[PDB]
């Protein structure tokens, strides 16, 4: 119901998010994923590291430069999981993937914007408690991603700025709600209450 | 598109091509190389289309073409036009 | 990775480094860092910024 949808990857499952996103792009919705480093996978760390190693040992033998390119970042892991769903070898699939943008962390201009979630892809809702899960920043740093220490240092600044913003907005909202409560009990407000507002 | 996944490639290429082609079409229209509408006075719809007669009447009204006229055919056209105007005059009278 | 966001040069430079910037030195007017030296004016607001 929007021109563009920003999705916070925190607390989500890679494959389910990939499925819903792919079917949205193929329908024509523009989507932007952020905080891929906080993304989650089902199963313990060991299993998924073993899986990535199984993927990593695969390579064209007579020339390694033309084989499966093993991208280490969480954004690229998610992009792989997604591209395997889309028929990316078609113009339709290319145009679909060109409606997508994946980012580690929340950079500008999306930091000053609203983010959403997908409840049929969240870990806490889809998984049963008492089940091991894996996080993608840890996995990528294990398999050779050399940037997890900068993204944390930057998110620690973004969060402070956002907290200042929220502390301002929350006092403004208190003022507004108090003024509205004082305006209430007027006959205009009674009519609005009757009509459902 | 793998080295830059967050950059559109094909949509930009197609934007470029469609604008490419639209400009060329508009200029081919401005240069009068495309044929006019069906009802315009200079149009040739329902008539016969022959570059020989077109060149004949153009050189009677009297920058590189493959269109010539074959003086043989020019003499033939003058002959047949004399016959045509003879018949028209016999209608005359 | 690492990104360069600004580079600052000195006021006066030698014909040697100017030659490094140039590829046909004997024909040029040698106009390399003129406007930068001009940007090194009274207080150097840009330089200090």
């Amino acid at each position: 119901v929007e021109p563009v949808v920003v999705i916070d990857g925190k607390g989500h499952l890679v494959g389910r998010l990939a499925s819903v996103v792919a079917k949205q792009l193929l329908n024509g919705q523009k989507i932007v994923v952020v905080r891929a480093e906080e993304l989650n996978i089902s199963g313990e760390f060991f299993r998924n590291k073993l899986k990535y190693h199984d993927f990593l040992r695969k390579a064209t033998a007579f020339n390694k430069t033309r084989g499966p390119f093993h991208f280490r970042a969480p954004s690229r892991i998610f992009y792989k999981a997604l591209r395997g769903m889309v028929s990316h070898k078609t113009a339709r699939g290319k145009a679909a993937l060109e409606r997508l943008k994946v980012f580690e962390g929340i950079p500008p201009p999306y930091d000053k914007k609203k983010r959403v979630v997908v409840p049929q892809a969240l870990r806490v809702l889809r998984l049963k408690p008492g089940r091991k899960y894996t996080t993608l920043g840890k996995l990528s740093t294990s398999v050779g991603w050399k940037y997890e220490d900068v993204v944390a240092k930057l998110e620690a600044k973004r969060k402070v700025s956002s907290a200042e913003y929220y502390a301002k907005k929350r006092a403004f909202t208190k003022k507004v709600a108090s003024a509205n409560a004082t305006a209430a009990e007027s006959d205009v407000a009674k009519q609005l209450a009757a009509l459902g507002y | 598109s793998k080295n830059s996944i967050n950059r559109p490639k094909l949509t930009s290429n197609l934007h470029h091509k469609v604008h490419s082609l639209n400009k060329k079409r508009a200029q081919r229209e401005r240069a009068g190389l495309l044929k006019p509408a069906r009802s315009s006075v200079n149009s040739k719809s329902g008539e016969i289309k022959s570059v020989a007669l077109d060149l004949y009447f153009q050189n009677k009204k009297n920058s590189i073409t493959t269109r010539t006229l074959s003086k043989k055919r020019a003499k033939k056209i003058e002959r047949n036009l004399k016959y045509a105007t003879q018949r028209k005059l016999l209608v005359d009278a | 990775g690492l990104r360069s966001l600004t580079t600052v040069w000195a006021e006066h430079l030698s014909d040697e480094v100017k030659r490094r910037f140039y590829k046909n030195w004997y024909k040029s007017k040698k106009k390399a860092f003129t406007k930068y030296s001009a940007k090194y004016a009274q207080d150097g607001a840009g330089i200090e910024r």
Partner: peptide
């Protein structure tokens, strides 16, 4: 800004990017 030419050059780059749709962050 840097106030001399970076302003014009950067706004022109961004508008070329937004007309050709060749921008990494913006659509």
């Amino acid at each position: 800004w840097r106030d001399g030419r970076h302003h014009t050059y950067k706004k022109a780059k961004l508008m070329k990017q937004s007309k050709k749709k060749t921008s990494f962050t913006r659509f």
